[PDB]
Design an enzyme around this catalytic site. Structure first.
Site, short mmCIF file in Angstrom:
data_model
loop_
_atom_site.label_atom_id
_atom_site.label_comp_id
_atom_site.label_asym_id
_atom_site.label_seq_id
_atom_site.Cartn_x
_atom_site.Cartn_y
_atom_site.Cartn_z
N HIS A 36 4.69 1.34 -0.66
CA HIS A 36 5.27 2.42 0.13
C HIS A 36 4.19 3.39 0.69
O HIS A 36 4.55 4.17 1.57
CB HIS A 36 6.32 3.16 -0.78
CG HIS A 36 7.00 4.32 -0.06
ND1 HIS A 36 7.67 4.18 1.14
CD2 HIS A 36 7.09 5.61 -0.40
CE1 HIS A 36 8.11 5.38 1.55
NE2 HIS A 36 7.82 6.26 0.58
N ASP A 63 6.60 -3.42 -4.76
CA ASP A 63 5.98 -2.15 -4.22
C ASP A 63 4.48 -2.27 -4.43
O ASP A 63 3.85 -1.80 -5.40
CB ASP A 63 6.50 -0.89 -4.99
CG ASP A 63 6.03 0.35 -4.34
OD1 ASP A 63 6.30 1.47 -4.89
OD2 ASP A 63 5.35 0.35 -3.28
N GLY A 141 2.35 12.03 -4.85
CA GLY A 141 0.93 11.93 -4.47
C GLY A 141 0.23 11.00 -5.44
O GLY A 141 -0.86 10.46 -5.14
N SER A 143 1.33 8.13 -6.34
CA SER A 143 1.68 6.73 -6.09
C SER A 143 0.46 5.97 -5.63
O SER A 143 -0.38 6.45 -4.91
CB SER A 143 2.74 6.67 -5.03
OG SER A 143 3.93 7.29 -5.50
N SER A 159 4.30 3.44 -8.95
CA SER A 159 5.36 3.29 -7.94
C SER A 159 6.16 4.59 -7.76
O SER A 159 6.25 5.11 -6.62
CB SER A 159 6.24 2.06 -8.28
OG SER A 159 7.29 1.99 -7.32
#
EC number: 3.4.21.12
Lengths: 198, 4
Positions: A36, A63, A141, A143, A159
């Site tokens: 993402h 992801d 932030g 991720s 994730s």
């Protein structure tokens, strides 16, 4: 830039995420991160300088992503820990119950334990399946950032999970935290990447 | 749940 797990990068000068791990594929340098965080060909920057572009990604369902880097980037087998680091030794997956830590640009380096596997996150954008859960906190932030044991076994990349209205799940008890990571080995296998170790 |  020095490519270290947990450090900030921006995508299209518009959003921020965290590096997962330094990788190679033959002569191409890269880092893995979450899907993402960007679409293919989006531009990644560190320290205000272009470092590379997203090579491939899957989100939702999975992801995961990787960013291919310019040859000038310096790949380190490291995950940031405050003013020090943890060396990346390998990718042996840890069991439920085992201690694990994560690193990212919002909450920094956080530790807790693995509390479930095979969890689905029902994000607004789509379900993401197969995630491992820990009780370390995290926030927006973080991720893409590294999950790694203190012994240096790289686990996966952040994730998401049950962020609260303030953008994190650090303000609730560890028993209520669902902090979810995408397992590393399937990312390295889909993309044919080698983890940089020391 | 939301992505971070």
């Amino acid at each position: 830039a020095n490519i270290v797990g947990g450090i900030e990068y921006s995508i299209n000068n518009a959003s921020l995420c965290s590096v997962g791990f330094s990788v190679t594929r033959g002569a191409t340098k890269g880092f893995v991160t979450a899907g993402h965080c960007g679409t293919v060909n989006a531009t990644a920057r560190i320290g205000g300088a272009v470092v590379g572009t997203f090579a491939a990604r899957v989100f939702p369902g999975n992801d995961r992503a990787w960013v291919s880097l310019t040859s000038a980037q310096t790949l380190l087998p490291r995950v940031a820990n405050g003013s020090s680091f943890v060396t990346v030794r390998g990718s042996t997956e840890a069991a439920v119950g085992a201690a694990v830590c994560r690193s990212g640009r919002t909450t920094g380096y956080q530790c807790g334990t693995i509390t479930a596997k095979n969890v689905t996150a029902n994000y607004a954008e789509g379900a993401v399946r197969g995630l491992t859960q820990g009780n370390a906190c995290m926030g927006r932030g973080d991720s893409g950032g590294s999950w790694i044991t203190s012994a240096g076994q790289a686990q996966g990349v952040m994730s998401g999970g049950n962020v609260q209205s303030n953008g994190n799940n650090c303000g609730i008890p560890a028993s209520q935290r669902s902090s979810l990571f995408e397992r590393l080995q399937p990312i390295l296998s889909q993309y044919g990447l080698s983890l940089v170790t020391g | 749940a939301a992505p971070x």
